[PDB]
Structure 1
Amino acid sequence: HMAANPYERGPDPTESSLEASSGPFSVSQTSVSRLSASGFGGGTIYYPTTTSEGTYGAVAISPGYTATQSSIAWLGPRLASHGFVVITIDTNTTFDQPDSRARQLMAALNYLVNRSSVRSRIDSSRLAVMGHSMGGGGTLRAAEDNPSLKAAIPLTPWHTNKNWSSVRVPTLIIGAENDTIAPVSSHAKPFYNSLPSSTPKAYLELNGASHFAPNSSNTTIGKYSIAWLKRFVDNDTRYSQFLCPAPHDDSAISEYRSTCPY
């Protein structure tokens, strides 16, 4: 038999538990000021209250162009309530390009491990990155330049670079069908196609959604982000059951591609 996974947290998942507003863990918050944050413009840290089940993995989430922390803040308690330490960040300037946001994502993870007040609750060897729009472009660049990351979830990503053939981090790209700012035909889909065949990857296209779909509470985005982070940050195979959907059975999903090598 396969060895027991020590990174498993929370009870066995179901479809109703993943689509719920909150997970099985209570969440507390703490803030990081812009001036004390070295490399990024501060943010808020979301962490589970209880530690009796062991340490958790850390996730850094970046907003998009001319966007602040509040546009992605709903992912904070949504992801943390399932057993993750999440930091939503602000950028140094609201006009920072994707390559600049990639550096600020790793700087936020560096703060979580070395300087944050919740560093004792974090497993430093299991980190992930997320982002919306240009933050999603910075997510791809961070995963390419930091292969030690466990997962990466670009949300309607935007980037001038379409070549991501060196990304070794399991990447879940979530695109919007009617995206007019970062069209999937020139952004999300070329990003997914350029990812290596040996890298676990998936492309989720939201049916009839706009570019700002990730800026509000979304059941589809929340369920598959939890499943992806659980599957690769925690190696939790209990969440693999949620990663093989049929788009014709979900009105919120218009497309789904996925390749798993391991």
Structure 2
Amino acid sequence: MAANPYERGPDPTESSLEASSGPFSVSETSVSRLSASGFGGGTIYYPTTTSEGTYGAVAISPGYTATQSSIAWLGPRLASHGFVVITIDTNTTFDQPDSRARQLMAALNYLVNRSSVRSRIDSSRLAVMGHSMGGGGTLRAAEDNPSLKAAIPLTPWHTNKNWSSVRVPTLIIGAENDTIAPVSSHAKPFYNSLPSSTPKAYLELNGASHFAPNSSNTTIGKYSIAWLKRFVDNDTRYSQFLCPAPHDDSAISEYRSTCPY
């Protein structure tokens, strides 16, 4: 048995992370706007099987004026690698980033305490993600809830540029050609303000617009899965994708260098 009790699924490959679906079959259920205390309802995607143990959970927020349909593809994509995922609607489509941060935490609270799949969730291993103003909300949730295990803002938008108190592992995904939350005034200032003692990464999508996160995207899927695995599951089998090195090769037992050059 693997030393890490949170490892789920077979050893990962680039192929298996780029594919449309991971190793786990996915089921879905929903929570109505009325039943959802403190948020606008959502769809819950979960692995049908329970025989490998409980899973971490992830809440995902859409952006300004948007609904679940703009982030829906992330549900099956991420859940099929071993996570319980809720794609939320917000109380109103005009909610600002700090309101979305509270709604992300309210959705996690619902999943852990009241949802029909709460028994397959490890309530100590939670994460937040979001698009645009939902990505701004992701940063605020990570700042205010340091017990979160991972945060992934997608083309984030926020008027606060200083995230120097974030102590949650954070992967920021920016879109090179974003004209709505330009990376020069949003994503990059956010990344630069995060502490260097916090595990972090910035991934910029070549040629991409603000709406790249709203449809199936091999790169967003690959690195979001690797980030959630590495930090929600402590799964160091995924370090090879986040921090590649020649010694990932089976023929190479060690590799040192004075890279970059």
Q: Is the partner of 2:256 in helix, strand or coil?
A: strand
Alignment coverage as a number of residue pairs: 261
Q: Distance in 2 between matches of 1:67 and 1:9?
A: 33
**Identity of matched residues, %:** 100
Q: Is the partner of 1:254 in helix, strand or coil?
A: coil
Q: Distance in 2 between matches of 1:207 and 1:103?
A: 32
Structure 1 residue 197 displacement after superposition: 1.1
Residues 37-78 of structure 1: CA deviation (Å, up to 9, x unaligned): 000000000000000000000000000010000000000000
Q: Is the partner of 1:60 in helix, strand or coil?
A: strand
Residues 121, 248 of structure 1: CA spacing in aligned structure 2 closer, same or farther, 3 A cutoff?
closer
Residues 118, 226 of structure 1: CA spacing in aligned structure 2 closer, same or farther, 3 A cutoff?
same
Structure 1 residue 256 displacement after superposition: 21
Larger Rg: 2
Residues 15, 7 of structure 1: CA spacing in aligned structure 2 closer, same or farther, 3 A cutoff?
same
Q: Distance in 1 between matches of 2:217 and 2:258?
A: 24
CA contact (8 A) 1:151 1:229 kept: yes
Q: Distance in 2 between matches of 1:107 and 1:231?
A: 24
Structure 1 residue 217 displacement after superposition: 0.1
Let me know the Cα RMSD of the aligned residues.
Answer: 5.3
Q: Is the partner of 2:92 in helix, strand or coil?
A: coil
CA contact (8 A) 1:205 1:253 kept: no
**Where does structure 2 lack aligned partners over 5 or more consecutive residues?**
none
CA contact (8 A) 1:206 1:252 kept: no
Residue equivalent to 1:197: 196
**Where does structure 1 lack aligned partners over 5 or more consecutive residues?**
none
Residues 202, 256 of structure 1: CA spacing in aligned structure 2 closer, same or farther, 3 A cutoff?
farther
Q: Distance in 2 between matches of 1:244 and 1:222?
A: 17
Residues 169, 87 of structure 1: CA spacing in aligned structure 2 closer, same or farther, 3 A cutoff?
same
Q: Distance in 2 between matches of 1:53 and 1:211?
A: 37
The TM-score with structure 2 as length reference comes to 0.93
Residues 123-157 of structure 1: CA deviation (Å, up to 9, x unaligned): 00000000000000000000000000000000000
Q: Distance in 2 between matches of 1:31 and 1:258?
A: 51
Structure 1 residue 79 displacement after superposition: 0.2
Residues 70, 77 of structure 1: CA spacing in aligned structure 2 closer, same or farther, 3 A cutoff?
same
Structure 1 residue 244 displacement after superposition: 2.9
Q: Distance in 1 between matches of 2:136 and 2:30?
A: 25
Residues 96-132 of structure 1: CA deviation (Å, up to 9, x unaligned): 0000000000000000000000000000000000000
Residue equivalent to 2:128: 129
Q: Distance in 2 between matches of 1:101 and 1:36?
A: 18
CA contact (8 A) 1:203 1:258 kept: no
Q: Is the partner of 1:40 in helix, strand or coil?
A: coil
Q: Is the partner of 2:255 in helix, strand or coil?
A: strand
Residues 198-233 of structure 1: CA deviation (Å, up to 9, x unaligned): 100000000000000000000000000000000000
The TM-score with structure 1 as length reference comes to 0.93
Residues 87, 226 of structure 1: CA spacing in aligned structure 2 closer, same or farther, 3 A cutoff?
same
Residues 6, 52 of structure 1: CA spacing in aligned structure 2 closer, same or farther, 3 A cutoff?
same
Residues 161-203 of structure 1: CA deviation (Å, up to 9, x unaligned): 0010100000000000000000000000000000011100000
Residues 76, 158 of structure 1: CA spacing in aligned structure 2 closer, same or farther, 3 A cutoff?
same
Q: Distance in 2 between matches of 1:228 and 1:242?
A: 9
